[PDB]
Design a protein around this ligand. Structure first.
Ligand SMILES: [As]
Lengths: 310, 310, 310, 310, 310
């Protein structure tokens, strides 16, 4: 039983994020728990303040015609309990629900440990015989407590795209809004726990430049290469199969190289030190002790710049 | 209260994928969230446009007779909220729901990291005393937004098998349709993270051809063999118990060999270098330095061709 | 409001497996999704074909008296949607539902990787003041599509025990039926991934029979023993705490031995080669190179026979 | 509408375990699926056998006043379907439901692999204006089929504490009963898979007493220490964070010691054999070959006795 | 149909924790199962004790006006069954439900293994045309049995913030309460299983100060570094991505250092003992045998103090 309008009925929206949590990098989802604030003029039930009752008259959902406001990017049906419905004199309705649903917004892992994200919530609404345009009411969109959690992420701002995008979808126009949750990552636990430990093993790796014992040079370069796999695998697990290249995926892989040429050197410092030409060997070994850390720190400036600086 | 027909009542179907996600290779399932569009002539409620009401008349599901359209390959009951029902003059009904259910479609891991898949959604419908044939309406089957996600997979096309397959199941004919979601994998994160690291350790493995120290040769070939298990196990975990052989399961196992004969060589380069016959030893060792990488790259062309090229 | 009988009312059952999946070895359960077909004479609503209506008259569950058919070995309440109810003239009722519930049937892991299983579904029914006997109608028990999945298992046959087992349970006789799902395992992925890799490490283990370097013999026998734990642990995890002995649990453990006496030998080949008695040492070492693989392959014939052959 | 009594109305209880399963040591819970048998005199609906109807009259739950019998230690609401209600002449009611709920009973891991447990189910009932005392009827408490499963546990007995415990909880007396499920563990798969493998590695550990090569002694004692972690971690995972000490937690940790002093010895057998005092070294090494296994087997009798014997 | 008041209607709250469990450090949540006790004066249904019925009159929820009391920090809708409603003469209502919901309270891992926590449950309530203030009734808040479980945590006290916090949220004041669950961890299983084993490997690490064999010194310091990753990874897994530094994350990382300079020393004890200057080498090595354990135990006092002592 929809509201007999004279033009496209505007529905007024708003989201008050109450709780954020379980942002799942692998799955590219996250769970939210918020208020949904809707409103519209249904002149059809305006109501003579003086003549009867009081200021505003409370209805149960069955009584009034309510607009179906579906969330677009949601795993299952949104999970909402209705909080209050308050029809104004002029026929204006004040709806408030408190849904919670896991939302499917994508993430850009291009700078992985040091990335910022922009999550989305959508809200479509389909037309019947009056057209429905949705739009935001910013006093119910200040939505975000001063307690919005979302572990391991700094929450920058909850805003929304005022202008809706109105489609024609299957011979019936819909109207979609864009609610934006912007967050930077709390990179850090990534250093004492990944970045640093990863570097340390790389350095030990090439302690075998000041060494001549092949036995203790392979026991050297090789033992550490293993440990680095232990970190490549640790990192690769809390992170999805990107079709592009991560930052840490870069350096973690560039690392795989300074373990090859490292093992190349120690290997050649020997089919060159049994070839009774230690003239050359400890020439190269002497040299690696510079080329390596330099070319590294150099390619890390080259690499890092290639990602952040551009 | 079914629609008094004169022949098999055609029901017209359609699916607009709104969201795709949680494709689970182990479980061989995936979750979808779409529109379901149905329609049929129930002349029994045609309705004199002029004589009353308006262009089209809205019903609640309880009022009209609606066809039970069950999804075949679904874990639990599909999870659908009804979006609109609009009966036309002639008695034509326009139904639209927005279900979300995890679907059980199988996958072919024969090319694992480089595989393409064809997921299915089914839709049966059982007959009563008028027969029901289902069939697709392609304006509600263009189903797939321009945002269909499905992480780590490229989505190629959402189509469907126009011709239904009508069974006789328990003295009552059913009619089933086939909705096809075709996707290729985003192989890649499989290289910097599996393929390459896996290769590197294999190479270092057989650096012990330019070496004579047994101690540093087993410390050599053996250390890396371990690391390779660390990758065989990593890979074997995000992948189900196929009764056939995966591609990466092949090469990952062919790899287990070039670690055995590698260990064979270093082992014989010694019961042959203590047998005061280093004549022979550093003949073999010298040789392995070719046989190995060749036979490998050879068996990789042999292997790769055996999977992709045929 | 039960059917006024003259003797024990027979209820006629039937299950059409539509989907099988999530067989969980650890949990000893599995999920099924099937049809449930029931039928009985309730003469009390026989209905004068000519005098009124038509051939068969459709009821909603609230209208008719229906027998409670509970599933015995089920985790929670069975999860069923009712598909059709069709009362015949004589008063015969035709009921059909489409339940899905995870079933708790036990498994016998005595031959683990090479085992066949017989899963059960039960169906009791309690009496009131007429006795209820259940029994099977085999045209609705041909239940099993030609698509019954159940990953990593070959499905041999869906049958059922015609004769019911009628208990007296708490001063009211019940009647239980036995629906049997027989499946063999797809042992195989167990070879390239467990059996073979497990053997290979055992072999390398005792390459240290053709060796004299204690350093590279412990680096030898010992490194492999580790790797075998890596497999004992892998296997032990996808498998419950049996009070009996698995097959692979046997050989996996018999393996632990050929790594002890292996380590025993290498160890004695030395407190006997420093005891300036290499007379004896390279007598034993020479010998082990036979005793071991023989006694193994011998005890594997002895073991294998002990499980399968008996 | 409760039963007008003259004193505390006795409600008669009973539980027929139909199915047991998913005992979860980590979570300290388990799932059961049983019958619940209740009964009480509601003289208020006694009913003139001859004057009307028959021997006993069947009611739907809505018709009669039924006592709320909540289970105390249950995760969520118990999940029950009602099986039959049969009011006797005198006004006696016969109630039977078939619930299934996961129960939260605690476990005592003090003897871990060799422990026996006593699981509980509770049943309270709150009073209104007549007091409710619950009590057991032992013909509906013989509850336990001859098929009660519960994998990896031997089921010893299903009994119950006849005398209820009546509390005063919030100005209204409740009455609670105690249903006892006693089970011993099927320790065993713990030997071929944990105990034995764990010992074997410990023994090889100290094969390095009959050795002099430091390289092969660290490669010896150390390699095995790792493997033992692989077991400590395996065990620690299928077992919760006890505030007390497990049995296997003891020996698994006492083991950590015989790997330290083991490594201590091999280490000192060398800063004492390079100190040109091999006089002493192979005095100690000689000695360890006894002290160790003895002190172990000694501390294992000391330890084992400390747990089981007391 | 709300209670015609003369001022802000006070609603009187109370929570009796019946069960605690599944505290999930990763997810920062936990499940509770408690009583919820509400009460308020609805003079509108006061009821002439003598004139009719009895002392107190029982209602079903549909009959009375009940306040919506939503829990704030909850994943999904709270899961509550209603236990009793008892309206007093004066019009006072006595409500009791038994909900169970997983709650989202944050945790402070700054002292990880030795941390104490303060979990929250919230309860808001929105106003309509009479204002709603909530407040606690402490005889129904003594909520916590003498069996409150919560594995691996010592439960210190269940209390609540008497004074509510009244917001203005979207043109309608709400009122929120704070129920506090305080718990210390059962650190301990963290010692025999993490702390101690972690230390032991560190010590063995630097046994290679009383050694001169580079081969057995890298086989020494390096083997253990690996094992330490095995612990860093074990610990890092049962713990979320803190933006701050854990205690065990500190020492676990400070440990990474005493493995670097350890490896630095053994490495320099050699490009200095081949440089025919063993004058210096076994000067340094001699020294490390003190500097290390001291600087450690020193930096552990420095570190530990930095977390607990401040
Ligand atoms: As090693």
């Amino acid at each position: 039983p929809p509201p007999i309008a004279d033009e496209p009925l505007t529905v007024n929206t708003g989201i008050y994020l109450i709780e954020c949590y379980s942002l799942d990098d692998k799955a590219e989802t996250f769970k939210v728990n918020a208020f949904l604030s809707l409103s519209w003029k249904d002149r059809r039930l305006a109501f003579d303040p003086v003549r009867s009752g009081v200021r505003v008259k409370t209805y149960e959902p069955e009584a009034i015609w309510i607009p179906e406001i579906r969330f677009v990017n949601v795993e299952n049906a949104r999970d909402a309990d209705v909080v209050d419905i308050s029809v104004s004199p002029d026929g204006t309705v004040q709806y408030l629900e408190r849904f919670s649903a896991r939302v499917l917004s994508p993430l850009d892992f291009r700078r992985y440990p040091f990335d910022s994200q922009t999550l989305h919530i959508y809200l479509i609404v389909r037309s019947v015989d009056t057209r429905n345009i949705v739009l935001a009411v910013d006093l119910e969109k200040v939505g975000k407590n001063d307690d919005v959690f979302l572990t391991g992420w700094d929450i920058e701002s909850f805003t929304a795209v005022v202008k809706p995008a109105n489609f024609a979808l299957e011979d019936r126009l819909e109207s979609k809004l864009d609610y934006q949750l912007r967050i930077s990552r709390q990179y850090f636990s990534y250093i004492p726990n990944i970045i640093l430990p990863m570097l340390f093993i790389l350095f030990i790796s090439w302690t075998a430049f000041w060494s001549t014992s092949y036995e203790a040079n392979v026991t050297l370069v090789v033992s550490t290469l293993i440990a680095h796999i232990a970190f490549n695998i640790l990192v690769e697990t809390n992170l999805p199969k990107t079709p592009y290249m991560t930052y840490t995926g870069a350096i973690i892989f560039m690392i795989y190289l300074f373990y090859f040429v490292a093992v190349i050197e120690v290997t050649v410092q020997h089919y060159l030190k049994v070839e009774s030409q230690p003239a050359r060997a400890a020439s190269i070994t002497r040299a690696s002790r510079i080329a390596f850390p330099v070319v590294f720190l150099l390619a890390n400036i080259i690499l890092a710049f290639l990602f952040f600086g551009f």
